[PDB]
């Protein structure tokens, strides 16, 4: 039993049993109070927050007769999502994402679950989730959520985790718009440094959902013990929502790529803005310096003193030269 | 039960009850007057504008016995279009899209409606809709919209909404037409800030349309309380169009996709072209200037004055070198 | 009249029957008017519509909407079909592209079919109706035995066939541009493409919305008899598909033209600087040294060192030459 | 009207199988394949050389096929689709092939029509991926004999699915060659080759993208055929096109990023020259200016009044050049 | 039978024979010493080094009746990792990579293996492998490897193989962080070369592992000759790795792909930065030297002498004009 997560602080127990009639919920740290709900007729949902605790799970897990490896695998926070099939229960590896705005940081939380008999087990590390509206449906008798069983109750949680990324979408757009305005007006250094932060976290997001599809697809392909009549209409929708994300990822991939060019295109303009100055100055002096060089040189036959008005006439012909090119300038280049 | 919308200004109600025989249309802001129309055997079409009113949503919902969310989710002005079937009513979320050509921006208004029995409730935040020609055929008993019930009206309402997207695409292309031309001829940075945001507007669009197919797809394969037969092929025609719509959207991206580089394409090439102009100037005068710079420097031995006419001969040897370079240039 | 041609003007009327035929050229505007109630379908040519006296007369003579007259006076307008209880106004263009220089001209052809007459309006001289005149002249086709209904289409189909030549015009220039860009590349090429690609976009400006224009009568034609012109519209639209595709076909190619052309010169940007560097970087050192002896001092090494003039120059030569080996090093 | 580029060869073949026995033949006779319209066992039919409008018209009118359905086949340039009917099934498909020698992707349309137990397959030229499919029909190998023409069609399409994977292998290998050239020994005109590949890659996306609807239309419906013995099978095929198209989008980024390597290589070697050009002119311009002053002529010359002036002038400016050396690369 | 490798130097053959009872091993380059152990009912692990030998590999291939082309394929050191299936034994193409951090080099080592009956063939290129701790378990009876057969050891070989790929990436991972710091701050020349080499080796990396993933799924779905599901679930562990490894490879691919263009905007922006200096340094002296060259010329009418204090005045006006350029600067 090895917990490799960073949350070893708080622990919490919550159990929500429901039926076509009533609803019940409580928060008791008692380990042996939530266990007798296992053989309950009505589907009994159980929450375990603060999964860092090995002692409680070691009692609860072995009260359910859970395979030893499955116990520690839960405590392992470094894992690629999957599903563990058994003759009694079904285990699934999941992840939750949280992106704090006004900052670029991607944190994750691994949620594990085991569906045995009528009981659904949700295992949390810290406080907070997107499965609160699910409880709202349970508590307020919203839909067929009171009638159906654990596999649907599980799907209700599965359906919620799907919407988790949809909520995360607007969180992404926030940092984009801030980064947008940085690029759109007065672009500067560290912007590209911020670009990578947005760019790196971008593909990283889809990278997680990518194998998670087959994790859910294999379920949608098999599920022998659970009712497939209920299953097929459930997961097929979730199976569709991954396409909604598949486009949504590329949606921002084009934005990040496109907006990146704007900061890059400005430099070319800025370069062109400067290289026009270096151009016009070099074109109005070096040819005239050539004139100053010839008369600067002294030869055998000197027409300067020979011809009348040798000195003043030199400035005259050069003055026009400086003008005629300006007319040729101030145009499209 | 909080309205987070940007329009809490005005509040409007309109009621239209019709049939193959009779017809009536009127605007009564009275919440009590529209209530007894719940038991109407004829299809009841009701307009409700100014959804900012929490009490009206509550009051109308109470008398109709509506779930809190179904009333509250409407007050939530930020929501994804979807469909929920019920034993009595049908929860539907829609999004009206509007675009102005002068100022480039995508403005929208969320639309939700509920259909139970013969009752239909259209909801709006602000004034304006595309259902004006719909009311025409209703009012003048034109089409089959009178002959059938609210179920076909439900289609007829959505039909006008889906049709609006086609017209919207027409405005988009012309904005692209002007935009794409500006980059071609004019390497000036004004369209650049316009493009990426106008591109973003189209990018914003596909985010809605793609999952919006489920709104059709759900009704297309199910409609348990609604009548069978007719309901599906009418939706099919729309479900066929929503394919063409989304395919039309992605097609537009290809234009803007490489159009961004065209801006950089001209600038980079012109910059280098300017360098070419600067190059040929600095390369021809300096060596010829270097010549006179040598004679500008004096020494003890000057063969130039030893052999007569050393002045004009130098002018000749320089003139050819400058020309033969220009000949070498323009290669 | 918003056009620029106020010079050339001509009036022609070719009235036919199932038996006989008549044609005449009378500059009098009042002369063609009594042909309105002529039992036989009367086709009328009006070239040089710049004259408002003919515009104002005919419009008031047939009772034509004032804006429709202005629509003819407006030479810059999208093709369309205007449905009315009596007549139908249609905007059409005649595309002509010379191979000598890149330019595509378009003359608007408006037509109004009312009662017993069909009107053709030309801005300047020239059309594709010369063989159509022959069909009215030589009794070729069903144009004689039918009324103004197919008589109008006989004018239409000839215009439809005109687009084919235009594709052949551009495609030839494309094939030339294929040889101009992909191989033997030079400047001003893109500028020719900048004219061609622009006209290519300018081409889709008309044809693409012209589909609905031809599709306007596809399912309608209210005053005239139907199902004769409908299968015509079918095959006519069968042609414009390949046309618009051919338009789009060139676009993808034309894109690949500049794209490869872009990286070509932008890579030579470095190559150009290679020449500008090696030339300018060998002068400033030498020009300075050759500019030293121009200065004045108390002690002169020029006179102190015998052969002061040639020795200094002789040694600096190789010092500038070794720069070539100093340069040219593989970057 | 046949607008295709293959009007040369033509061939007709019919493969009729059972759960026990099997028979096949090659007869160009148009009236030999028609009486198998009422064949109990599912009939598989191969027709290459769709340029012939007579057979398509003859066989089509024999099956009561709508002229437009026969006309859509005559059109060789078309987007894949699915059209359900109360009797038969009409589906349009495409075949893509790439050669490594010259960078180009050749295309071919396959329009199949399933009516009851009769399946039609139409081609322009010789060559297909249905050869290993025939083997199972030939050797009584697998479930393919037991199930009907619906699973046959499923298998026919299923075989066409993996064809893209192998087709994806081609471009990825071309990428590998492109990975080599752009990075190692960067070369001009390679972008032109790359831009063609870009044009080739986008060209492929035109088919697979609406082909999702092609698969989704079938999979989520199947009105005439047996649903539960067909629908879950279409899924895996409908699942693959997601896995396929995602791999397609993957290459789009791969080639895009590597395309900028050659671009980045140029600007770097460009700037490589610029920094050198800078320090050359910047040092002599002030120095040349100084000597140019003493070259000027006036009424008063203090240079002669400067004791030991000449040796120190060239020396005092000698330090100015030195302090700029360390200043370089600050 | 053509050897295409670079190691024609050394040769060695080790044979490790064990059972559920004992263990025994020997190292004999003699060909006819390792052959009679073919009919051994006990699992026999046979090392094969000196793959340059076309004759012995043939001879052993002759002794086992191995297909001639397969023998040449073993002699072929240029091949995609795959599995050649046979009715009795099984041929598999594999690779072993080694990377040093000092000099960036990804070297390749192809090891083919064939398990016939109880005999295990392992074709080495040169001396040494990562199977050193694997030999300990066979020798010192460490684990259930003794109680099980060589088919279980067959997967135990993959363990040493895959564990290398883990450490391999861990070695390679060190360079990216450094290359980042090279790109993020203090960017310079040769950075592209490191960006090239590390990515180039990474290209070679996926080019090997990605098709090597098909090796497992080839057997994992079947394993026809050996025991099924008594070997298959072991593959599932590496099956998780071979996908995650290539994704961890893909991780480095995406990072380097992004790390590259950051350096592009780094230089290109600072390219103009130096051009700012060259512009303002040159353009100010362009007229100055020209002005000095004006009076450098000589004429019949010289107003310089006509103008009192001609020398100090001219040098005075050029003092302020050159300075205002920096004030004329700071525009855009």
mmCIF file of C-alpha atoms in Angstrom, chain E residues 101-301:
data_model
loop_
_atom_site.group_PDB
_atom_site.id
_atom_site.type_symbol
_atom_site.label_atom_id
_atom_site.label_comp_id
_atom_site.label_asym_id
_atom_site.label_seq_id
_atom_site.Cartn_x
_atom_site.Cartn_y
_atom_site.Cartn_z
ATOM 1 C CA UNK E 101 24.800 11.857 -22.203
ATOM 2 C CA UNK E 102 28.326 13.171 -22.807
ATOM 3 C CA UNK E 103 28.222 12.803 -26.582
ATOM 4 C CA UNK E 104 24.753 12.548 -28.111
ATOM 5 C CA UNK E 105 24.646 9.105 -29.723
ATOM 6 C CA UNK E 106 21.814 6.600 -30.125
ATOM 7 C CA UNK E 107 23.421 3.285 -31.071
ATOM 8 C CA UNK E 108 21.452 0.238 -32.205
ATOM 9 C CA UNK E 109 21.751 -3.444 -31.302
ATOM 10 C CA UNK E 110 19.506 -6.025 -32.961
ATOM 11 C CA UNK E 111 18.796 -9.167 -30.949
ATOM 12 C CA UNK E 112 16.723 -11.922 -32.540
ATOM 13 C CA UNK E 113 15.378 -14.798 -30.452
ATOM 14 C CA UNK E 114 14.040 -18.294 -31.130
ATOM 15 C CA UNK E 115 12.541 -20.599 -28.502
ATOM 16 C CA UNK E 116 12.499 -24.160 -29.833
ATOM 17 C CA UNK E 117 11.070 -26.825 -27.507
ATOM 18 C CA UNK E 118 12.984 -26.242 -24.274
ATOM 19 C CA UNK E 119 15.888 -24.508 -26.012
ATOM 20 C CA UNK E 120 16.109 -20.714 -26.154
ATOM 21 C CA UNK E 121 18.159 -18.967 -28.833
ATOM 22 C CA UNK E 122 19.341 -15.403 -28.233
ATOM 23 C CA UNK E 123 21.398 -13.843 -31.021
ATOM 24 C CA UNK E 124 23.773 -11.167 -29.724
ATOM 25 C CA UNK E 125 25.784 -8.708 -31.808
ATOM 26 C CA UNK E 126 28.582 -8.147 -29.298
ATOM 27 C CA UNK E 127 29.489 -9.004 -25.701
ATOM 28 C CA UNK E 128 27.199 -7.888 -22.884
ATOM 29 C CA UNK E 129 23.485 -7.338 -22.347
ATOM 30 C CA UNK E 130 20.825 -6.128 -19.915
ATOM 31 C CA UNK E 131 19.881 -9.737 -19.170
ATOM 32 C CA UNK E 132 22.531 -9.924 -16.438
ATOM 33 C CA UNK E 133 20.092 -9.798 -13.510
ATOM 34 C CA UNK E 134 17.837 -12.193 -15.436
ATOM 35 C CA UNK E 135 20.590 -14.814 -15.293
ATOM 36 C CA UNK E 136 20.686 -14.431 -11.507
ATOM 37 C CA UNK E 137 17.068 -15.545 -11.130
ATOM 38 C CA UNK E 138 17.817 -18.611 -13.245
ATOM 39 C CA UNK E 139 21.067 -19.269 -11.389
ATOM 40 C CA UNK E 140 20.229 -18.373 -7.789
ATOM 41 C CA UNK E 141 16.649 -19.695 -7.941
ATOM 42 C CA UNK E 142 15.164 -16.217 -7.536
ATOM 43 C CA UNK E 143 11.405 -16.276 -8.056
ATOM 44 C CA UNK E 144 9.018 -18.818 -9.563
ATOM 45 C CA UNK E 145 11.117 -18.846 -12.738
ATOM 46 C CA UNK E 146 12.579 -22.224 -11.749
ATOM 47 C CA UNK E 147 9.155 -23.766 -11.142
ATOM 48 C CA UNK E 148 8.080 -22.445 -14.540
ATOM 49 C CA UNK E 149 9.555 -23.064 -17.993
ATOM 50 C CA UNK E 150 11.585 -21.124 -20.553
ATOM 51 C CA UNK E 151 8.383 -19.788 -22.112
ATOM 52 C CA UNK E 152 7.943 -17.915 -18.841
ATOM 53 C CA UNK E 153 11.602 -16.943 -19.127
ATOM 54 C CA UNK E 154 10.786 -15.764 -22.652
ATOM 55 C CA UNK E 155 8.748 -12.950 -21.123
ATOM 56 C CA UNK E 156 11.422 -12.486 -18.458
ATOM 57 C CA UNK E 157 13.717 -11.549 -21.338
ATOM 58 C CA UNK E 158 11.280 -8.807 -22.340
ATOM 59 C CA UNK E 159 11.502 -7.511 -18.762
ATOM 60 C CA UNK E 160 15.206 -6.693 -19.090
ATOM 61 C CA UNK E 161 14.498 -5.337 -22.570
ATOM 62 C CA UNK E 162 11.673 -2.962 -21.627
ATOM 63 C CA UNK E 163 13.335 -1.840 -18.387
ATOM 64 C CA UNK E 164 16.125 -0.547 -20.619
ATOM 65 C CA UNK E 165 13.649 1.554 -22.617
ATOM 66 C CA UNK E 166 12.476 3.130 -19.361
ATOM 67 C CA UNK E 167 16.001 4.121 -18.344
ATOM 68 C CA UNK E 168 16.732 4.984 -21.986
ATOM 69 C CA UNK E 169 14.073 7.700 -22.014
ATOM 70 C CA UNK E 170 15.227 8.779 -18.550
ATOM 71 C CA UNK E 171 18.683 9.350 -20.038
ATOM 72 C CA UNK E 172 17.248 11.145 -23.068
ATOM 73 C CA UNK E 173 14.885 13.175 -20.866
ATOM 74 C CA UNK E 174 17.912 14.881 -19.308
ATOM 75 C CA UNK E 175 18.843 16.562 -22.591
ATOM 76 C CA UNK E 176 15.500 18.258 -23.259
ATOM 77 C CA UNK E 177 15.521 20.159 -19.957
ATOM 78 C CA UNK E 178 19.055 21.332 -20.723
ATOM 79 C CA UNK E 179 18.135 22.110 -24.333
ATOM 80 C CA UNK E 180 15.163 24.082 -23.013
ATOM 81 C CA UNK E 181 17.467 26.157 -20.808
ATOM 82 C CA UNK E 182 19.661 26.582 -23.887
ATOM 83 C CA UNK E 183 16.646 27.838 -25.847
ATOM 84 C CA UNK E 184 14.713 29.649 -23.100
ATOM 85 C CA UNK E 185 17.725 31.692 -22.001
ATOM 86 C CA UNK E 186 21.173 32.431 -23.506
ATOM 87 C CA UNK E 187 20.403 31.181 -27.044
ATOM 88 C CA UNK E 188 23.335 30.618 -29.416
ATOM 89 C CA UNK E 189 24.703 28.681 -32.405
ATOM 90 C CA UNK E 190 24.940 24.847 -32.400
ATOM 91 C CA UNK E 191 21.670 24.799 -30.424
ATOM 92 C CA UNK E 192 19.947 23.722 -33.641
ATOM 93 C CA UNK E 193 22.403 20.829 -33.943
ATOM 94 C CA UNK E 194 21.476 19.581 -30.472
ATOM 95 C CA UNK E 195 17.861 20.289 -31.400
ATOM 96 C CA UNK E 196 18.522 18.253 -34.540
ATOM 97 C CA UNK E 197 20.465 15.350 -33.009
ATOM 98 C CA UNK E 198 18.169 14.831 -30.014
ATOM 99 C CA UNK E 199 15.111 14.973 -32.268
ATOM 100 C CA UNK E 200 16.832 12.937 -34.988
ATOM 101 C CA UNK E 201 17.601 10.190 -32.478
ATOM 102 C CA UNK E 202 14.018 10.560 -31.272
ATOM 103 C CA UNK E 203 12.800 10.063 -34.840
ATOM 104 C CA UNK E 204 14.893 6.892 -34.986
ATOM 105 C CA UNK E 205 13.456 5.947 -31.591
ATOM 106 C CA UNK E 206 9.768 5.906 -32.543
ATOM 107 C CA UNK E 207 10.721 4.393 -35.905
ATOM 108 C CA UNK E 208 11.804 1.342 -33.902
ATOM 109 C CA UNK E 209 9.403 1.127 -30.950
ATOM 110 C CA UNK E 210 6.144 2.036 -32.723
ATOM 111 C CA UNK E 211 6.251 -0.935 -35.096
ATOM 112 C CA UNK E 212 7.735 -2.985 -32.240
ATOM 113 C CA UNK E 213 4.440 -2.519 -30.391
ATOM 114 C CA UNK E 214 2.906 -4.902 -32.931
ATOM 115 C CA UNK E 215 5.192 -7.657 -31.616
ATOM 116 C CA UNK E 216 3.173 -8.144 -28.427
ATOM 117 C CA UNK E 217 -0.303 -7.809 -29.950
ATOM 118 C CA UNK E 218 0.772 -10.408 -32.511
ATOM 119 C CA UNK E 219 1.239 -13.038 -29.806
ATOM 120 C CA UNK E 220 -0.854 -11.486 -27.008
ATOM 121 C CA UNK E 221 -3.970 -12.258 -29.054
ATOM 122 C CA UNK E 222 -2.805 -15.791 -29.858
ATOM 123 C CA UNK E 223 0.430 -17.437 -28.704
ATOM 124 C CA UNK E 224 -0.268 -20.591 -30.748
ATOM 125 C CA UNK E 225 2.646 -22.890 -29.894
ATOM 126 C CA UNK E 226 3.370 -21.982 -26.259
ATOM 127 C CA UNK E 227 0.970 -22.137 -23.317
ATOM 128 C CA UNK E 228 -1.860 -19.622 -23.677
ATOM 129 C CA UNK E 229 -3.071 -17.345 -20.854
ATOM 130 C CA UNK E 230 -0.208 -18.715 -18.759
ATOM 131 C CA UNK E 231 2.030 -16.386 -20.754
ATOM 132 C CA UNK E 232 -0.443 -13.934 -22.301
ATOM 133 C CA UNK E 233 -1.382 -11.969 -19.150
ATOM 134 C CA UNK E 234 2.318 -11.244 -18.627
ATOM 135 C CA UNK E 235 2.442 -9.538 -22.030
ATOM 136 C CA UNK E 236 -0.374 -7.262 -20.846
ATOM 137 C CA UNK E 237 2.027 -5.595 -18.406
ATOM 138 C CA UNK E 238 4.496 -4.700 -21.154
ATOM 139 C CA UNK E 239 1.495 -4.013 -23.397
ATOM 140 C CA UNK E 240 0.760 -1.122 -21.045
ATOM 141 C CA UNK E 241 4.394 -0.045 -21.315
ATOM 142 C CA UNK E 242 4.949 -0.377 -25.077
ATOM 143 C CA UNK E 243 2.068 2.051 -25.601
ATOM 144 C CA UNK E 244 3.071 4.365 -22.752
ATOM 145 C CA UNK E 245 6.728 4.282 -23.817
ATOM 146 C CA UNK E 246 5.875 5.351 -27.367
ATOM 147 C CA UNK E 247 3.602 7.984 -25.825
ATOM 148 C CA UNK E 248 6.447 9.072 -23.554
ATOM 149 C CA UNK E 249 8.427 9.080 -26.785
ATOM 150 C CA UNK E 250 5.558 11.042 -28.335
ATOM 151 C CA UNK E 251 5.745 13.276 -25.263
ATOM 152 C CA UNK E 252 9.332 14.167 -26.131
ATOM 153 C CA UNK E 253 8.309 14.512 -29.781
ATOM 154 C CA UNK E 254 5.663 17.129 -28.996
ATOM 155 C CA UNK E 255 7.962 19.012 -26.613
ATOM 156 C CA UNK E 256 10.880 19.211 -29.054
ATOM 157 C CA UNK E 257 8.396 20.102 -31.802
ATOM 158 C CA UNK E 258 7.342 23.069 -29.683
ATOM 159 C CA UNK E 259 10.795 23.795 -28.269
ATOM 160 C CA UNK E 260 12.136 24.285 -31.798
ATOM 161 C CA UNK E 261 10.013 27.198 -33.026
ATOM 162 C CA UNK E 262 10.493 29.048 -29.735
ATOM 163 C CA UNK E 263 14.148 29.319 -30.742
ATOM 164 C CA UNK E 264 13.012 30.599 -34.143
ATOM 165 C CA UNK E 265 11.176 33.578 -32.656
ATOM 166 C CA UNK E 266 14.170 34.033 -30.356
ATOM 167 C CA UNK E 267 16.758 34.602 -33.085
ATOM 168 C CA UNK E 268 14.491 36.275 -35.656
ATOM 169 C CA UNK E 269 13.431 38.918 -33.135
ATOM 170 C CA UNK E 270 16.986 39.494 -31.924
ATOM 171 C CA UNK E 271 18.056 39.465 -35.570
ATOM 172 C CA UNK E 272 16.298 42.805 -35.974
ATOM 173 C CA UNK E 273 17.731 43.882 -32.611
ATOM 174 C CA UNK E 274 21.289 43.913 -33.951
ATOM 175 C CA UNK E 275 19.984 45.531 -37.136
ATOM 176 C CA UNK E 276 18.711 48.378 -34.956
ATOM 177 C CA UNK E 277 22.294 49.089 -33.917
ATOM 178 C CA UNK E 278 23.750 48.731 -37.421
ATOM 179 C CA UNK E 279 21.075 51.134 -38.647
ATOM 180 C CA UNK E 280 21.610 53.894 -36.083
ATOM 181 C CA UNK E 281 25.403 53.520 -36.111
ATOM 182 C CA UNK E 282 25.774 53.632 -39.895
ATOM 183 C CA UNK E 283 23.076 56.159 -40.849
ATOM 184 C CA UNK E 284 24.521 58.851 -38.575
ATOM 185 C CA UNK E 285 28.026 58.641 -40.056
ATOM 186 C CA UNK E 286 26.812 58.367 -43.658
ATOM 187 C CA UNK E 287 26.444 62.138 -44.006
ATOM 188 C CA UNK E 288 29.293 62.992 -41.609
ATOM 189 C CA UNK E 289 32.156 61.584 -43.693
ATOM 190 C CA UNK E 290 30.424 63.117 -46.711
ATOM 191 C CA UNK E 291 30.465 66.544 -45.042
ATOM 192 C CA UNK E 292 34.170 66.132 -44.280
ATOM 193 C CA UNK E 293 34.755 65.272 -47.932
ATOM 194 C CA UNK E 294 33.096 68.506 -49.046
ATOM 195 C CA UNK E 295 35.879 70.767 -47.788
ATOM 196 C CA UNK E 296 38.272 67.974 -48.715
ATOM 197 C CA UNK E 297 37.678 69.177 -52.258
ATOM 198 C CA UNK E 298 39.626 72.097 -53.719
ATOM 199 C CA UNK E 299 38.302 75.023 -55.750
ATOM 200 C CA UNK E 300 39.180 78.427 -57.203
ATOM 201 C CA UNK E 301 36.896 80.278 -54.790
#
